[PDB]
Paper text:
In our work, we purified an active form of chicken mtPAP and determined the crystal structures of the mature wild-type (WT) enzyme (residues 37–568) alone and in complex with ATPγS, UTP, GTP and CTP substrates to 1.82–3.1 Å resolution. The purified mtPAP crystallized as a dimer as observed in solution. mtPAP consisted of an N-terminal domain (NTD: 52–194 aa) and (using the domain nomenclature of the DNA Pol β family) of palm (195–341 aa) and fingers (342–527 aa) domains. The palm domain is composed of three α-helices (α6–α8) and a mixed five-stranded β-sheet core (β5–β6–β8–β9–β10) that forms one wall of the active site and harbors the catalytic triad conserved in all members of the Pol β family: D237, located at the base of β6; D239 on strand β6; and D319, which belongs to β10.
Loop Lα3–β4 (121–138 aa) from the NTD extends across the central axis of one dimer toward the second molecule and forms a hook, and the insertion Iβ6–α7 of one palm domain of the second molecule loops onto this hook. Here, the Iβ6–α7 of a palm domain of one protomer in the dimer complements an additional β-strand (β7) on the far side of the four-stranded β-sheet core of the NTD next to β4 of the other protomer.
Author numbering:
A (entry chain B): 52 to 126, 131 to 527
B (entry chain A): 52 to 247, 254 to 527
């Protein structure tokens, strides 16, 4: 039910899953028939990534060890044994060419130039936005692949750090991730002995000889450094390992070839996890939330408002928060404020970080459904109108209050960090970039207000969402 | 027990051993009583190294995992440690106010030998040169406890390598295992880390990352282990990575044991050399007595040094001593070719095309009929090399003969396991001449002294007379 319960279930399924690089001439039935001899298979799919790969989700974890028991070491290699397998035929020239294999599950979304025609063939702006959402959103197969990537990194980390867990956060889990997005991973340490340890009969407290480091930051940097070097030199399918240990949140970036994901590994950050669960709640509350976010992120990218590299540009996160604020301010609100979510929280949902109460309700059924019935056609235009006429000089965005309030500090765009006091999430944004955003918003509002959609359809020209998803 | 069988047994015992940093107020009985609840303990001892530490050797390996299952990270330590779990434990009292046993002193096992200034008086009170040399040997040689500690150090380093090379081994060589090591000597360690089912309709293999060329692989693996030694455990390690040397090397101080260590990738020739020396050391007690005394002599007179350079090495010196013993009438030890001829098929070892075989079973070697005393052998060693023609002759330990020098080098000692290689190529003419001068002077001192009067006069005599600066 809850965000935490979804993560637990996803990780358990990943724990009994494996990846297989398939033979050039793949017979699906023969492969599955063989794998089923090691135990029942709950789920599986194929994907393309420099050849065909299969994700296999066994019903029982024991099946993994069963398969590993008949798997050999190639024959010079780093003999780290994993859940990455390569299957080939003994006598490849004695099997014929295969007629109709296999269904491929896409791990990327269609490019904008292919999307636009689909949008133009839609009946309304609402339908356009749902088409975009369906084309872009993470698939069940992609999600399974993301959790398996985390599970594999966990196993790699567990060689030196047996209590390691690796769990995804951000776009991979908050409902706003699009196909192709990075897998952001958090490493944490928790006792694998989940069972109830007795009262020991002896007199001693017993610990490992470990250096007590002055800061959590230094420990984090040393741990990530070793894991990074090990992935680089010893880990199968890990490439382009970049150590970015001196960043605000120390980080190791890498490309995971078996899955084709770009990944980012850091040590667990409690604030970042609260943020992911908050966005998950908002995304789950109403489908218009996700529809708006996906369309507006695409809009921002198309018009050069967002960028892949950090700088003076508004970030996708900042933009997403602006959208949440917009939705909080509808009459009636489409989503509750963070203070409203805090007040619905019981003792079990108490989360205090750095002295600041970051509590909010985890049970979605405790949130009264919105009575707002505005269509996406209205909301898209109104978003552009609202921020196109928003006084950014005088007002800041407070998502806890759901109100425009005086700016604590002078900054072009001030959006309050909802889990840290006196922090602006959009402090990076300069006046030029903010003015560009405003100009694009106003132009987009005008285009939607003035267009004759029926004639554009007849004239075979872009209309509605498509009209604002092309350069001006 | 062959050399190989000794190593195997030692490593197996180290594999089921742990190190425990003991409570400030240590009750030995309570500690052992508690630890025995995880399984029987075959051996244990205590040593001093910034507080009391205990080596615990469990009867069963399973006991290690049992102890680890109740070992925890403090709440205050969370997020502030590198969570590498090891066989290094710290024990403290749950309630410091719950001591309810009589306090007894704990026996400390020494890991160092007495300094020369304390040794000399003991030598001067001996009855003969032979007795002096056996006193030195007994004061200096590795103890059973020290040996266990050395193998455990290797075992701990092995566990770092095994994270991604599960079949890895780390084994000591050189002075730690060849019978000629003295307390306080480095632990020289070799890593061997790579190249060590039902049939379905698919061939099935793991996806594994390729290693680079042997040297590059060696450099990367040693670099990571060096980083582990830095960051895993209590640390304070003084890790020196010397990865660009001819033989890539990591030097470090292992704080839990207090050993100075050198880690490199396994060299098959160096291992044969260690077993050869082990054979020679085991054959006759005079072999070890001579080597220990002469190594001490070399150090005292500045002929050997802790850092590599133009100095004769302890290994080269030891080989010179072996050559000397091969040349006695009759020989005290056999030549390497004699040991080769005694080898059966099971003792076959060919390295780089060169037959490095020799007998491993010591009972197959006929005991020496030489009955020369150490008094004679010590003086004769100095006399022999003091008059040896180093310009014209080289030392061949396979033949047990002086032979023409293959290449021009001040001191030429044939590498017994590699063709056309001089183990003492590093030695320059100045250092060789110093050695010769010291040898000749030492011979004269022993030849001319009146030992009875020196004893009465309370002056150094015999071995003591050559173990002080000239
Ligand atoms: Cl194949
Ligand atoms: Cl997030
Ligand atoms: Cl996008
Ligand atoms: Cl040796």
């Amino acid at each position: 039910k809850t965000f935490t319960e979804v993560q637990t279930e996803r990780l358990e399924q990943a724990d009994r899953s494996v990846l297989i690089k398939c033979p050039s001439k793949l017979n699906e039935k023969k492969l599955l028939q063989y794998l089923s001899s090691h135990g029942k298979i709950d789920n599986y799919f194929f994907f393309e990534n420099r050849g065909i790969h299969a994700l296999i989700e066994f019903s029982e974890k024991s099946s993994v060890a069963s398969l590993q028991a008949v798997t050999g070491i190639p024959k010079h290699v780093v003999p780290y044994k994993s859940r990455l397998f390569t299957f080939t035929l003994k006598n490849p020239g004695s099997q014929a060419a295969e007629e109709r294999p296999v269904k491929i599950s896409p791990q990327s979304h269609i490019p904008v130039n292919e999307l636009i025609p689909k949008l133009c063939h839609a009946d309304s702006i609402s339908s356009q936005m749902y088409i975009l959402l369906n084309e872009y959103q993470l698939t069940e197969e992609n999600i399974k692949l993301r959790y398996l990537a985390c599970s594999l990194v966990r196993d790699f980390a567990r060689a030196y750090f047996p209590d390691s867990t690796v769990k995804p956060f951000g776009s991979s889990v908050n409902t706003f991730g699009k196909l192709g997005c990075d897998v952001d991973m958090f490493l944490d340490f928790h006792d694998i002995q989940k069972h109830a340890t007795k009262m020991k009969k002896g007199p001693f407290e017993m610990e490992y000889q470990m250096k007590r480091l002055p800061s959590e930051r230094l420990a984090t940097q040393k741990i990530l450094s070793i894991i990074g070097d090990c992935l680089d030199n010893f880990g199968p399918g890990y490439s382009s390992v970049q150590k970015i240990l001196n960043a605000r949140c120390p980080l190791v970036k890498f490309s995971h070839q078996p899955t084709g994901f770009q990944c980012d590994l850091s040590v667990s950050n409690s604030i970042a996890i609260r943020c992911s669960e908050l966005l998950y709640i908002y995304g789950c509350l109403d489908p218009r939330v996700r529809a708006l976010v996906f369309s507006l992120r695409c809009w921002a990218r198309v018009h050069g408002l967002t960028n892949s590299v950090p700088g003076t540009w508004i970030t996708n996160f900042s933009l997403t928060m602006m959208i949440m604020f917009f939705l909080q301010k509808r009459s009636p609100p489409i989503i509750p404020t963070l203070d409203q979510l805090k007040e619905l929280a019981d003792e079990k949902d108490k989360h205090v970080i750095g002295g600041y109460d970051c509590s909010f309700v985890s049970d979605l059924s405790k949130i009264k459904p919105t009575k707002n019935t505005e269509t996406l056609d209205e909301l898209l235009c109104d978003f552009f109108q609202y921020f196109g006429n928003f006084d950014f000089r005088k007002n800041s965005l407070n998502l806890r209050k759901g109100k425009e309030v005086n700016k604590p500090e002078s900054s072009p765009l001030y959006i309050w960090n909802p889990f840290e006091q006196d922090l602006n999430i959009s402090k990076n944004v300069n006046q030029p970039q903010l003015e560009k955003f405003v100009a694009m918003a106003r132009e987009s509002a005008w285009i939607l207000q003035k267009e004759d959609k029926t004639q554009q359809m007849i004239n075979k020209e872009p209309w509605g969402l498509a009209a604002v998803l092309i350069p001006f």
